[PDB]
């Protein structure tokens, strides 16, 4: 599923991401844009046996277990497959575990490099929520 930005913003807010650890909602929508381009089925293999899954591209070496990654930690205690649904619940839940403090969004490279420093609020203005 490819979310529209407003549609995704409303969902993330309903799931408690608006101002989570002090991160305004736009940061999460912006992160999704650059990580998965809003595609809930987005998948991407990296040089290391790691693969990132879902709207927020959760990593299989540290956060979710996919079974094909050496050195898996599975810190979110969840199957990577569980993160490829139209329902963003599992991905947000894992995202909330990843961001344990006010600097946590650095967990997403795209966010640090393409969202931080930009008007992330622009991704949500005009969205009914």
């Amino acid at each position, epitope marked *: 599923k490819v979310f529209g930005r407003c549609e995704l913003a409303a969902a993330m807010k309903r799931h408690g991401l608006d101002n989570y650890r002090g991160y*305004s909602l736009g940061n999460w929508v912006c992160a999704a844009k650059f990580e998965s381009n809003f595609n809930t089925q987005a998948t991407n293999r990296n040089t290391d046996g790691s693969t990132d899954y879902g709207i927020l591209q959760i990593n299989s070496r540290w956060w979710c277990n996919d079974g094909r990654t050496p050195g898996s930690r599975n810190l979110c205690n969840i199957p990577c497959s569980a993160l490829l649904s139209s329902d963003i619940t599992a991905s947000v839940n894992c995202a909330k575990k990843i961001v344990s403090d006010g600097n946590g969004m650095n967990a997403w490279v795209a966010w*640090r490099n393409r969202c931080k420093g930009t008007d992330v*609020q622009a991704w949500i*203005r005009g969205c009914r929520l």
Partner: antibody
């Protein structure tokens, strides 16, 4: 250790410098705010981490904000100075829609 | 542009008392409202952001609330260090603006 310090002409095309440290200008916005003697705060404008700028609607034609990421400096330029521009000028770091650290400011008299 | 109307202009109160400052915006600012405190001869300092979140180190007696176009800052059992000035500021899109300020002074 996040710090910001204004540097200005003192009296006067105006030119004030905001020297920062403790963070990268590529990751945060820097706002310019002024406060006339014994008055309230007035927003002047800002330069986002990505270089974009926005200005006070009424003062836009007289303001120019720019920066040099490599020297951790942000600049405020204001021309057509008038008595009404006399005030303390502040630069402040914006972190995700709140000005979290402010410089001590620098007083200017036109 | 969005304009903020802050009231009252001043407040005379005594330590222990509870006071409320309001800030209403001519347009919906979607909770993007912050509050700052400013002591005489000092730079403004962040107190609350995104309507209800206290900045690090700010005592819990400070509480912010609001939504849409109306907001307020409340100080329960205000203390000596609370006296000084307060300003609200919105962050809804760019032309940002501040409220007119409130001087909280000792009764």
């Amino acid at each position: 250790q996040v710090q910001l310090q204004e540097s200005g002409p003192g009296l006067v095309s105006l030119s004030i410098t905001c020297t920062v440290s403790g963070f990268s200008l590529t990751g945060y916005g820097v706002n310019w705010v002024r406060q006339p003697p014994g008055k309230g705060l007035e927003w002047l404008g800002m330069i986002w981490g990505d270089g974009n700028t926005d200005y006070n609607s009424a003062l836009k034609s007289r303001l120019s904000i720019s920066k040099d990421n490599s020297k951790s400096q942000v600049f405020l330029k204001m021309n057509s100075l008038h008595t009404d521009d006399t005030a303390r000028y502040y630069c402040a770091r914006e972190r995700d829609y709140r000005l979290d650290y402010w410089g001590q400011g620098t007083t200017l008299t036109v | 542009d969005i304009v903020l109307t802050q009231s009252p202009a001043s407040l005379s109160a005594s330590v222990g008392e509870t006071v409320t400052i309001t800030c209403r915006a001519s347009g919906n600012i979607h909770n993007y409202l912050a509050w700052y405190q400013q002591k005489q001869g000092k730079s403004p300092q962040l107190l609350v952001y995104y309507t209800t979140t206290l900045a690090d180190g700010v005592p819990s007696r400070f509480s912010g609330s609001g939504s849409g176009t109306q907001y307020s800052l409340k100080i329960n059992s205000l203390q000596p260090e609370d006296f000084g000035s307060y300003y609200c500021q919105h962050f809804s899109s760019t032309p940002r603006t501040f409220g007119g300020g409130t001087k909280l002074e000792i009764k």
